[model samples]
Target chain A: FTKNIFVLDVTAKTLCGAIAKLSSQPYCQIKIGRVVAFKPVKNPEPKGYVLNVPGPGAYRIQDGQDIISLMLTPHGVEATTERWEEWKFEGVSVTPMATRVQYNGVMVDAEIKYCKGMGIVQPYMRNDFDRNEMPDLPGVMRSNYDIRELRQK
Target chain B: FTKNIFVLDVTAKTLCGAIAKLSSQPYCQIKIGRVVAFKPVKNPEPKGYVLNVPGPGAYRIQDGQDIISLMLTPHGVEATTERWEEWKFEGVSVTPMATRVQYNGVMVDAEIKYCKGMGIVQPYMRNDFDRNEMPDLPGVMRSNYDIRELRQK
Candidate 1:
C-alpha cells in the first residue's frame, strides 16, 4: 500500500551533522539563524539555522531548545521557537521513496517516506494535481541522488 | 563528488515491466506511443510506452530497434530513434540518488544519478530552478515513498 504521509525525524545533532556534510557543496551556504517566527500569532524568537543554496528554497531550522522544527518555503525558509512534539528522530538514515500532495488552499499537506534500510534517499514516485487546489505547473520536477561513491567510500 | 549527469540504461523488456509495476499505482497511467520524433521529423513505428502521473511529467521510450532511448519532459516525454552506445543495463537494480538541472534557455539538461544496490526506484530530488530557462515556481514539491510492505512481502 502507498503511504500518504511519512516523516523521518532526525535528531538536532544528526541534522546538524548532515547540514555540515552538505555544506561542502561549493554553491551551498548554511548559517545558524538568529530569529524565528511562529504561526497564527506571527511571533518571532531567536533560534534556527538558515540554508541558502542554488536549488530548492532556503531552509531554516527552529531550535526548540530540544526538539527542533524545520520550516521550508518557496523563496526562503524560516522557523519559530515552537516545539515539534509530533516528530522524533528515527535513529538511522531513512530515505524517501514516494510522495503524494493533497492541497486544500488553506494548507498543503504532503505525505513522504524515508524508508529504513533503503540505502538510498530520493522519491521514485509522485502524484501531482490530484486535488483541485493543486496547480498543474509547466515543466516537471525531478530528483537525483548518488550512491556509487557512497559504496566506494 | 556529486555527479552532474547520470543516466541509467535498461533493457526494453525490463523497462516495460517496471512501467507495468508502477502502473499498479491507482494514481498513475502508462501507455505506448506510436510516433517517435526527433530533428523535427516524426516517424511511426512500434516504439515504447508513455507514462502519465501526477508529479513527474510525461515520459516515453523510443526503441532503437536494438537499443532503447528514454525520454523525459516537463509536460510529455519524447525520444528520437537514435542509438545510445554509451549505456547498458547493469543487470541489477539501480535507482536515482541525486538530480541537478542546468538550464541554458536553449536547452534544459539534467544531471542525475541512478545508484546501484539501492533496492528502490524513483528520484526524490531535483533543482526545480537551477539554470536559465528554468522557471522559479511557487510552492515546494516534495515526494514520499513506502517500502515497509516491500520488505515484509
Candidate 2:
C-alpha cells in the first residue's frame, strides 16, 4: 500500500472492549472500549517514556471511564460527550494505524507492539512519539502490560 | 462483562485499523467510515479536495492509480491503506456534540454525538468506476487525484 493514508492526530481507533449487538453488514450501533488503567513505557532509550492503554481480551473491563458508545451508519459515526471542548483533532490529519504500515519494503511487526503477544510480527510503531524525558510523574501518574507488568525493581 | 486482559504499551493506546473503526462507547475515538466517491467532475471552491496526507515518507499519490487501499485520517488526511495485513479505518472519534459532515460543499451529515472526537475518510475505490456506484452520501470533491493543477499544496 504505497498510497499515503491519512493518519490520526489525537483520537485513536480503540478495540471493541464491549458492544451493543454490533455486527457486520448494515446495522450501525455498538459500544467499545479499552481499560483506562493504562501505563507508561520506557521509550527511545530511556529519558523518554510512552503511556499506553490495554487492548480488549483477557482484560477486566468496566462500564466506567475510557468507554465509548457509537452508532455509525452509511452516514457517519456519532457519540455523546459532556464537554464539547475536550475534543481536539478537528481538521487535523491522522493515519488509520499508529503502527506505520508500508511496503517500500513490506512492513513487519516491531518489538512488542499492541501486545500482539511475543514473536508475532506486525507493523512498526509510528516513531512520531509524544516523548517525555520525565515520564515518572507529572504525566497522569500512569498505568501497564500484564496484571503485574508495571512493578519495577 | 469481565475478563483478564493484557495491558498495552503507552504506544498501543491508539486503536489501529478498522478495529476501533468498529468499536465505541463513552469517551471513545472511533474511525467512522465515509466513502469519498471519485469524481470525473472537478470543482474545488467551497468544497475541499481530498487533501494529501502530509508527513515524512508520506504516500506519494499518483494520478489514475488504484487508490482503493489508502484511506485517510484527519491529520492532513494522511494516506494509509484500508487493509494492511489487518489494521485499518477512515472514520473519526465519537463525540456528543455535533460532527459536521460535508460532501460537494454540502453538509451531508451531522448529529449530536457522544464520542470524544475524530473521523476517517476511506480511499476512493477506482475500478469499473472511479467512485463507488453505491448510492449514499454525496461525493466529496476528491478530484486532485484525477487532475494535476487541482492537486492542492
Candidate 3:
C-alpha cells in the first residue's frame, strides 16, 4: 500500500521547510502505476472525454494549486483521514524532539506527517471551456524525510 | 542546450522494441522545473497558452508517432540527429559489439540510441471549447537504472 504514494528521500536543513521545498525541486521523483481512465460512477456529468492513459514515472505538478486531483491511485500514499479537516489550517511547525536520527552513510534525521486525502491532478475536457479556470483537487502526500548531513563541497 | 528530453535506461531482448517499450512502463519517473505561462517565442499563435511547468525525471514514448518533442534538458542523455527522420523507419536492430557493457555490481549490458526530440504530455487550459479534446504539452524526463537480479520468491 505504501508503495503507491509519491516518495521522496531528501536532505535539507529544516524539517518543515524541506517538506515544502519538495514541491519545488527538479529532481523530485513521482511514481504511479495502475493507470485508469476517468469516468463518473454515480451521477454522470454533461460531457467527459477519455484521454489516453498517462505513462508512469516521475510527474511534475506545476501550479499544483490549480490542478484538480481525481481518484487517488491504488497503492499510493494518502492523507490522514482520522484527523480533522481543519487540521490542515494548523500552522506549519515541526518539533525536533519527534524527529529521529538513523546512522546511514551520514547521520539521517527524519520525520513523518500527514494532512488530508490524496488524489491526482488531471485535466478534463468538457464542453464549455474556460481558459482562465484551472481545475484541481487533492490527493495523498505522505512525505517522510531523511535529512542527511549536507556533503562538504 | 540538450536539456529538456525524457530519458530512460532499459534492458530488453531487442533494441527497437526496447525503446518502444520504454513509453508504456508504469514505473517511469519524470521531473522538471520552472513553471511559466505558455506563449510562442517568435511566430505567435492566437490560442497558445501555457498552463504550468513540469519537473524532470524519466519518460517513455510507446507509439513514438504523433508525438512532437521540443527541447532536451541538460545533464541527460539525448537522441541521434545526424540520421534521417525517415531513418526512424529503419529496422529495429542493435549490435552487441556496439552495445556497451559496464562492469559494476554485475556485468550490466547497456545500449545507447537516440530518436529525434523528447517531451512530456501534460493537461493544459486552452481557449478552445471542445469536449472531445484534451490539452497537453511537452516537458523533460531523466532516468538512470540500477538493474538488480530478479530473485525467485
lDDT of 2 at A88: 27
Provide per-model DockQ scores: 0.08, 0.02, 0.01
Q: How many times do residue backbones clash in model 2? A: 75
TM-score of chain A of each: 0.20, 0.16, 0.18
For residues B42-148, could you state the per-residue lDDT of candidate 3 as single tens digits? Answer: 11111111111132222222111212222223323223312212111111111011112222333222322222112232112121213233122111111121111
Candidate 3, position A117, lDDT: 18
lDDT of 3 at A44: 10
Model 2, which residues run further than 4 Å from truth?
A1-35, A38-86, A90-111, A114-153, B1-40, B44-49, B52-81, B85-153
Candidate 1 local Cα displacement, residue B34, angstroms: 13
Candidate 1 residue-pair clash tally = 24
RMSD (Å) per prediction: 20.7, 23.6, 24.9
Candidate 2: residue A153 Cα off by (Å): 58
Candidate 3, which segments miss by more than 4 Å at Cα?
Answer: A1-40, A44-148, A151-153, B1-118, B121-153
The per-model lDDT (C-alpha) reads 0.24, 0.21, 0.20
Model 1 bad stretches (over 4 Å): A1-12, A15-153, B1-153
State the lDDT of candidate 3 residue by residue for A1-153, as single tens digits: 111122222232222114324445311222223442211121111111111112211111111111112222222322221211111111111111111222233323322221111112222223111333322211111112211121113
